[PDB]
Amino acid sequence: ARVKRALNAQKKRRTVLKASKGYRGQRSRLYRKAKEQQLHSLTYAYRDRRARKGEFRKLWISRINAAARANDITYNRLIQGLKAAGVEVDRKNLAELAVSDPAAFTALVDVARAALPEDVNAPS
Amino acid sequence: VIKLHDLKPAPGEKKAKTRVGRGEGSKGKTAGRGTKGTKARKNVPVMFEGGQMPIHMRLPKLKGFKNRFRTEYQVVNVGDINKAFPQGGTVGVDELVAKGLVRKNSLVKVLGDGKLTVKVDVTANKFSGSAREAITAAGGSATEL
Amino acid sequence: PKAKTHSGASKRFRRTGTGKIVRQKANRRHLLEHKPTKRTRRLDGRTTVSAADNSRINKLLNG
Amino acid sequence: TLKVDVKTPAGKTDGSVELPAELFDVEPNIALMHQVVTAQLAAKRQGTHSTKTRGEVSGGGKKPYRQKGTGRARQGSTRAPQFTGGGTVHGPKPRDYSQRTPKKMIAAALRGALSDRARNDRIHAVTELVEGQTPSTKSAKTFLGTLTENKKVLVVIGRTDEVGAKSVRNLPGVHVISPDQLNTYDVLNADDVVFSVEALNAYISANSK
RNA sequence: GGCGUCUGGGGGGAACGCGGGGAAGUGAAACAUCUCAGUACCCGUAGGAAGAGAAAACAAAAUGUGAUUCCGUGAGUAGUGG
RNA sequence: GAGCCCGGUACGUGAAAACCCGACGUCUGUCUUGAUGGUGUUCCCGAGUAGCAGCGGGCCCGUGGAAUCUGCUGUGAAUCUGCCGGGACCACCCGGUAAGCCUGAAUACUUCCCAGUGACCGAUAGCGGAUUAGUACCGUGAGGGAAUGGUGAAAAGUACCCCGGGAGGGGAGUGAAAGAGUACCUGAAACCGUGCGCUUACAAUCCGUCAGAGCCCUCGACGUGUCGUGGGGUGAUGGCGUGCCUUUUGAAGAAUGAGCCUGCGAGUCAGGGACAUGUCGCGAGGUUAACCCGGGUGGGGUAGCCGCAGCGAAAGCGAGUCUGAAUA
């Protein structure tokens, strides 16, 4: 039985070419170049899914730092005071409060300042 | 009712053939040969040892000759006679052949491995000493061709 | 085509009752003056084939 | 012991045939029968498929062109496998597919198939398929309809029963076999096995003796 | 030797046959004995097939087979071999 | 997609002539001028032959202790109490009768003819050759050696009109279909256009990926635009980011290879081969080979082969055996 290769190959070629819509130049037209770019794209996506959590945490920390310095307190002392006070709001919702409900953020800053020690540089 | 489409091989009877050089998933680009060398292309003969004098040549040939005129006997022990002739009686060569104790067209020698407790008359080509004593001890006779 | 067995291996190796492969020891043809009798006695007879050479000798004997 | 009662084309019972246990009461063995019928179909297959290797295709005895200076790939012939029109690398060659199946395996598979048929009383015996000396497909078709309503039937008649063989020859579901040619594939392919009395007795005489 | 008169031959053909002549690449991890291989090729000749064939044979003490050819074993054995 | 429409099929039938097989004859040869079993002796029984020697060939045998067979060169016998062979050779036994010739069957093969078959190919496949094929073409020559199949059920192959020199097209018709028009089944990719949407001329980009404004489209819900468990296109802008393969200690590359697409292109087969491991049958037994008979895949076929006792160079002995003076 002589077997022609067309159907089996066309299947995966169509899959790869469809996945490469929107690419520039050869990378969206030719199957080989599109396949190379697909390897790179999936590697990039895998790496970026891991890095995205850190990126968003960095953005939240930036916003919380801005809103805390607006209340005359630094981010690190505010985090220490919030941990001491036992409140368990994470940085995502802390930034959400900072942007959407400034009064709530000010109240949390007040409780964090209350929970802080009297001399932060003491050998405690 | 068994039909032609109910017939299946036994579990574990059939095993898929492994097809090499069919992509990096199974065995790709090398078919399990590793990188280059003699063995990556054709083969190495069994008798070859790398230029060192081989094992089949640095040892001496086994001593002696073969004696083309050697006479060989198919052997049967008296224990087999006991296990196969519970009633005794005459025991010739082709009774042993019929019982499947010896091959059909061969010289037969009786040996004395087992225990013989049946009165048996044996006609073979040769006997060992212990075989003769065992056959005569049970009252049987040991005549030889 | 039926397999052809190796002639030299057939002349140099033997099989015992339980299938053990047995060979003869070397250094016992000539130059036996300076060799003490204890050396030639330890070289006499036959020994079983070492485990390293068992596969090669079995291959050379069977085919 | 299972009993088969003989029927005549006139529509009346004639007598009985006793089916021996060692022939029609063995426990069917699926793997054994599978191996036997697979070997049968392999023996049937003819391997008249061939291709021309790199050395059998026409021409291509001369090295084509310059190995160097060209800047092209080095080719030793125009009939190398990578070339269009060149030879085939590992292509079909004529071969024989028959297998050397042991006799006991074959006989046991046949016995298992026949015993499976006899367990579900798909075995029938008749004196003759039609009134003698003149083939008639209508009469044989009516008689087979009386015997069974299944689709595929196996008719086992003697080699001298020319009138019956010609009578059932044209029926689409009927396959006619001689008693000494009985085989696992034809038995397992049939919903019913209609035996001729003489053919049944001949099979029993050949085996049970 | 010449003259006359009768009867043949000549060349072709794919494979198969018989008789002669006869490589090298290759293997031996080199190479010359050896292998390849009596192969490739060549020469002379057939026939529908050919060749062989009617014991100056085997055998081993069996009161044994009984022309030749071909098939299976014997057997990768007995042997033979830098 | 037809057993009942056609050619056919099962089954029957048919040869003037030629040829091929038989048979019965004429015809020819041949024995009967014949036959048997008995008795004691001379002659004959294949000559430049056998044998021997030298040098070779070929036999499992590579010159070896080298028999049997055979070529050339020398030498060269006996006719039966003769001669040859039984692996140097000799004696004894056994077998046979060289140097004369014919011989059928069992066996090998297919240029060619006839009838069939395929878990063979289906137009880059299958023959080099489905088409002008050993052709065109290439070479002084021996020689090398291609490419090119499919409208439609039927040609019904587009009358007539219009633009145009034509080609080509538009109407009109044929057609079931002209998204079947003799550039013709289906009509993929690379490659080349046209139209619409988004984007892009202060910007250093392995060309993607993750966030993502704006714009456009779409599905639901409520009003008039405004969210939603929504979905798609494009994406200003920010973060990250050194192509694939091969060979390498190590290459994103300044080590290797690849212009692109579509087709094609690499662990296969044979053998009662060898070893190992699954599975099935039978089991101290298992199994047949050639072959024979079945229109088959079935039945027969005991010759062999492998297990069933080993030790020893071997004679040989044997649950033992070898070495050894030894139960050492």
Side-chain angles (χ1 to χ4, degrees), chain B residues 74-77 79-81 83-85 91-106 108:
Chain B
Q74 298 309 113
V75 303
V76 55
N77 300 291
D80 314 348
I81 277 53
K83 261 168 42 59
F85 286 79
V91 175
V93 158
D94 78 0
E95 295 51 14
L96 305 186
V97 173
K99 285 278 152 69
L101 304 188
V102 290
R103 305 209 174 145
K104 48 188 190 185
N105 285 315
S106 61
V108 175

Side-chain angles (χ1 to χ4, degrees), chain D residues 29 32 40-46 48-49 52 57-60 62 79 81 84-85 88-90 95 100 102-106 159 169 175 177 180-183 186:
Chain D
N29 191 343
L32 169 86
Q40 250 184 302
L41 290 176
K44 163 173 208 177
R45 163 189 212 180
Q46 64 172 60
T48 43
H49 43 56
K52 303 188 138 51
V57 295
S58 179
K62 141 226 58 200
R79 302 312 190 184
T84 278
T88 310
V89 176
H90 299 307
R95 56 195 277 225
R100 288 202 23 192
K103 299 171 152 167
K104 295 197 189 183
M105 297 195 66
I106 300 170
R159 213 180 257 87
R169 211 153 53 158
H175 183 242
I177 192 98
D180 51 345
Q181 290 303 309
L182 260 172
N183 54 101
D186 287 337

Side-chain angles (χ1 to χ4, degrees), chain A residues 15-123:
Chain A
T15 273
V16 158
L17 272 183
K18 163 122 84 175
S20 312
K21 273 193 184 346
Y23 293 4
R24 208 178 198 265
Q26 287 193 345
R27 281 157 223 252
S28 49
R29 291 159 176 90
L30 316 172
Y31 161 72
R32 264 147 30 111
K33 315 292 156 87
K35 158 163 181 237
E36 284 164 48
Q37 195 38 70
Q38 222 44 51
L39 287 181
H40 286 324
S41 303
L42 289 199
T43 288
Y44 283 150
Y46 181 87
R47 167 256 275 159
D48 284 324
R49 276 194 310 269
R50 301 290 169 100
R52 169 213 289 143
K53 299 133 177 64
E55 284 277 22
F56 268 111
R57 190 173 155 128
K58 150 204 305 301
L59 171 74
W60 300 326
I61 286 171
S62 267
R63 299 195 174 160
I64 296 158
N65 200 353
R69 268 150 207 279
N71 290 266
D72 158 46
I73 197 175
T74 55
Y75 165 90
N76 63 351
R77 292 304 172 196
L78 162 75
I79 286 301
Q80 162 191 26
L82 275 192
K83 182 203 135 158
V87 4
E88 303 304 23
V89 185
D90 61 4
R91 287 142 186 79
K92 176 179 84 157
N93 305 122
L94 273 187
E96 193 44 34
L97 281 193
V99 172
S100 321
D101 200 333
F105 195 90
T106 311
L108 281 193
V109 158
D110 282 295
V111 320
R113 200 130 47 191
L116 275 173
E118 313 59 15
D119 162 347
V120 284
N121 295 296

